[PDB]
Amino acid sequence: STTTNSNSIGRPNLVALTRATTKLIYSDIVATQRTNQPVAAFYGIKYLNPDN
Amino acid sequence: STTTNSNSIGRPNLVALTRATTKLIYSDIVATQRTNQPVAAFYGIKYLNPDN
């Protein structure tokens, strides 16, 4: 009675990979703009009462 | 080893402006109709009972 144990398995099948990565959230949390110099300048222009 | 400290940065890049203004709400809160004379008169017309 030749069962399966008489047989010998070969190369098991690689069914599926599994990478793990976080849901990266930085495009929506912050506002971005590319800078063409190593130092960036953001302008704060304010409207003041006569008491500043 | 000519590091980056030898280089001198030039004009910093003005990435973005920033002004502060409230969400001005006076067109939607109150009813507006332009007046053509330095005194405006709004009529008040009422319907009364025989007891006023």
Burial string for A7-39 (b: 16+ CB within 10 Å, else e) reads: eeeeeeeeeeeeeeeeeeeeeeeeeeeeeeeee
- What does the DSSP 8-state code read for residue B17? -
Asked if B12 reaches chain A (Cβ–Cβ under 8 Å), the answer is yes
CA distance B8 to A38: 10
Residues of chain A contacting B11 with CB distance shorter than 8 Å: 37
Give residue A49's identity as a one-letter amino acid code.
N
Sign of the CA dihedral with A31 first, then A34, A40, and A41 last: negative
Question: What was the elucidation method?
Answer: cryo-EM
- What does the DSSP 8-state code read for residue B12? P
Give residue A30's identity as a one-letter amino acid code.
V
CA distance B47 to B43: 13
Documented resolution in Å = 3.9
